[PDB]
C-alpha cells in the first residue's frame, strides 16, 4: 500500500509467469495481452507492486 | 526510464549548427527528479 | 457434465480448466451452469 515498485531489475532472462498462463498460481486479469503469450511478447517492465 | 543523449563536436555563446544527439543511456530509475547541479 | 474445483467454477478462457480440463470455443454458443456441490459431491475432498 506504501509501495509499488516498477524496476526491481532492468534485465531479466527468467521470464515465464505461467502463474497466469495455466493459472497454476492464482486468479488474474490481463489487459491488452493474451495470458498465454508470455514468451512470445516482451516488455521492458519486469516487476511491479 | 532515464535517458541521456550526447554529441561530440568542436565548438567555435553557443554557436548554432545542425545536428542531433545520439543516446548514451536508457536506465529505468523511477526518480522524481525536479532539480539538478553540475559537477566540475 | 463435469465437476470442477480446479479454477473454481471458471468459452473465452485459457485456464486450469481450459488446458487441463476442457475448452469451450471462444465463439461457443450455449449456456453454462455451475452448482457448488460441497454438500452434494458427497465426499468433500473430491480427490
From Swiss-Prot, chain A:
Changing residue 22 to F: In strain: Omicron/BA.2, Omicron/BA.2.12.1, Omicron/BA.2.75, Omicron/BA.4, Omicron/BA.5, Omicron/BQ.1.1, Omicron/XBB.1.5, Omicron/EG.5.1. Attaches the virion to the cell membrane by interacting with host receptor, initiating the infection. The major receptor is host ACE2. When S2/S2' has been cleaved, binding to the receptor triggers direct fusion at the cell membrane. When S2/S2' has not been cleaved, binding to the receptor results in internalization of the virus by endocytosis using host TFRC and GRM2 and leading to fusion of the virion membrane with the host endosomal membrane. Alternatively, may use NRP1/NRP2 and integrin as entry receptors. It comes from Severe acute respiratory syndrome coronavirus 2. Binds to host ACE2. RBD also interacts with the N-linked glycan on 'Asn-90' of ACE2. Cleavage of S generates a polybasic C-terminal sequence on S1 that binds to host Neuropilin-1 (NRP1) and Neuropilin-2 (NRP2) receptors. Interacts with host integrin alpha-5/beta-1 (ITGA5:ITGB1) and with ACE2 in complex with integrin alpha-5/beta-1 (ITGA5:ITGB1). May interact via cytoplasmic c-terminus with M protein. May interact (via N-terminus) with host bilirubin and biliverdin, thereby preventing antibody binding to the SARS-CoV-2 spike NTD via an allosteric mechanism. This is Spike protein S1. The chain holds residues 350 to 398 of 1273 of the full protein. Changing residue 27 to A: In strain: Omicron/BA.2, Omicron/BA.2.12.1, Omicron/BA.4, Omicron/BA.5, Omicron/BQ.1.1, Omicron/XBB.1.5, Omicron/EG.5.1. Changing residue 26 to F: In strain: Omicron/BA.1, Omicron/BA.2, Omicron/BA.2.12.1, Omicron/BA.2.75, Omicron/BA.4, Omicron/BA.5, Omicron/BQ.1.1, Omicron/XBB.1.5, Omicron/EG.5.1. Changing residue 24 to P: In strain: Omicron/BA.1, Omicron/BA.2, Omicron/BA.2.12.1, Omicron/BA.2.75, Omicron/BA.4, Omicron/BA.5, Omicron/BQ.1.1, Omicron/XBB.1.5, Omicron/EG.5.1. The gene is S.
UniProtKB/Swiss-Prot annotation, chain B:
Changing residue 20 to V: In strain: 20A.EU1. Glycans are attached at residue 32. Binds to host ACE2. RBD also interacts with the N-linked glycan on 'Asn-90' of ACE2. Cleavage of S generates a polybasic C-terminal sequence on S1 that binds to host Neuropilin-1 (NRP1) and Neuropilin-2 (NRP2) receptors. Interacts with host integrin alpha-5/beta-1 (ITGA5:ITGB1) and with ACE2 in complex with integrin alpha-5/beta-1 (ITGA5:ITGB1). May interact via cytoplasmic c-terminus with M protein. May interact (via N-terminus) with host bilirubin and biliverdin, thereby preventing antibody binding to the SARS-CoV-2 spike NTD via an allosteric mechanism. Attaches the virion to the cell membrane by interacting with host receptor, initiating the infection. The major receptor is host ACE2. When S2/S2' has been cleaved, binding to the receptor triggers direct fusion at the cell membrane. When S2/S2' has not been cleaved, binding to the receptor results in internalization of the virus by endocytosis using host TFRC and GRM2 and leading to fusion of the virion membrane with the host endosomal membrane. Alternatively, may use NRP1/NRP2 and integrin as entry receptors. This is Spike protein S1. It comes from Severe acute respiratory syndrome coronavirus 2. The chain holds residues 200 to 242 of 1273 of the full protein.
Amino acid at each position: 500500500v506504501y509501495a509499488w515498485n516498477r524496476k526491481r531489475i532492468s534485465n531479466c532472462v527468467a521470464d515465464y509467469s505461467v502463474l497466469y498462463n495455466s493459472a497454476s498460481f492464482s486468479t488474474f486479469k490481463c489487459y491488452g495481452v493474451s495470458p498465454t503469450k508470455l514468451n512470445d511478447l516482451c516488455f521492458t517492465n519486469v516487476y511491479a507492486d | 526510464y532515464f535517458k541521456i543523449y550526447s554529441k561530440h563536436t568542436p565548438i567555435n555563446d553557443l554557436p548554432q549548427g545542425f545536428s542531433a544527439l545520439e543516446p548514451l543511456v536508457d536506465l529505468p530509475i523511477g526518480i522524481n527528479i525536479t532539480r539538478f547541479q553540475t559537477l566540475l | 457434465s463435469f465437476v470442477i474445483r480446479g479454477d473454481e467454477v471458471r468459452p473465452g478462457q485459457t485456464g486450469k480448466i481450459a488446458d487441463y480440463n476442457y475448452k469451450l470455443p471462444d465463439d461457443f454458443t450455449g449456456c453454462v451452469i455451475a452448482w457448488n456441490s460441497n454438500n452434494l459431491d458427497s465426499k468433500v475432498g473430491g480427490n
